[PDB]
Design a protein around this ligand. Structure first.
Ligand SMILES: CNc1ccccc1C(=O)N1CCC(Nc2nc(-c3cc4ccc(C#N)cc4[nH]3)nn2C)CC1
Ligand SMILES: CNc1ccccc1C(=O)N1CCC(Nc2nc(-c3cc4ccc(C#N)cc4[nH]3)nn2C)CC1
Ligand SMILES: [Cl-]
Ligand SMILES: [Cl-]
Lengths: 121, 132
């Protein structure tokens, strides 16, 4: 199973690395490793993905774009938000959840590995 | 029949951005109905917002996005708009110091998806150019 991961450029590099390390236990992570080429490559990975996992704690035009394109490709999507950051998640992302193919889970830093295990189990 | 225009922008930049977005929307209103003109952005359950947003995106002839401020919502609207085969104009202010996301800049084809850099004072004249 091919897994897609994305997060904003903006602090918690270790937490993104931890997420990708955990996802690597469930399949290949396409995204583990001028602007037109970047866009085309991203869209190819989104289409190959069996599941899209986004870290949506920090605002990002790119992460939002990938999620909108992923919904339209009918991808299974999991968004991870950290309410301890103090921010309030965009209603466009929170409101896209249906509980099945599009899910938005709040989490605390310590439980992210166990939440991902429960998601794939 | 009046063209239907969709406008979006982040709710995080500052009060001067709010007055600038009002000026963009005021100029857009000269060219068509602005579906999102009454969105009380500064004050921004969540499912109803998402569904009303998708209805407006699907009903638009052109989507105009102010992409200077990073925003998950603006990005999501743009990804849904591309998949809805919408004609799109992104407006970016390079004086902000930021470098626009390659996902947005790289989506441009110079025709149905364009990204235009601008200075706040020329926004009305730039919209006249696009909408003429
Ligand atoms: C100002 N913004 C931008 C400026 C220039 C270029 C892109 C953007 C942009 O909008 N972005 C950045 C790229 C994001 N997508 C993305 N991120 C990742 C990614 C992060 C990451 C971290 C750790 C590890 C490990 N181990 C692996 C990782 N894989 N894969 N992909 C596809 C979307 C948002
Ligand atoms: C933390 N983020 C969020 C938290 C809660 C709710 C949404 C967001 C979010 O992600 N956002 C905000 C809403 C954005 N979309 C949007 N903006 C507008 C809009 C702005 C505006 C300004 C002036 C005037 C006038 N006159 C009219 C305007 N119309 N319409 N729409 C559909 C996408 C990004
Ligand atoms: Cl980003
Ligand atoms: Cl926003």
């Amino acid at each position: 199973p091919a897994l897609y991961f994305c997060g904003s450029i903006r602090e918690d590099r270790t937490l993104y690395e931890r997420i990708v390390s955990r996802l690597r236990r469930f399949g290949t992570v396409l995204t583990e490793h001028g602007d037109r080429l970047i866009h085309e490559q991203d869209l190819e990975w989104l289409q190959q993905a069996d599941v899209v996992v986004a870290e949506v704690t920090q605002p990002s035009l790119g992460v939002g774009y990938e999620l909108g394109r992923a919904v339209a490709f009918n991808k299974r999507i999991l968004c991870l938000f950290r309410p301890q950051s103090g921010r309030v998640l965009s209603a466009m992302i929170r409101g896209a959840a249906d509980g099945s193919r599009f899910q938005v889970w709040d989490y605390e830093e310590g439980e992210v590995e166990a939440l991902l295990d429960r998601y794939f189990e």
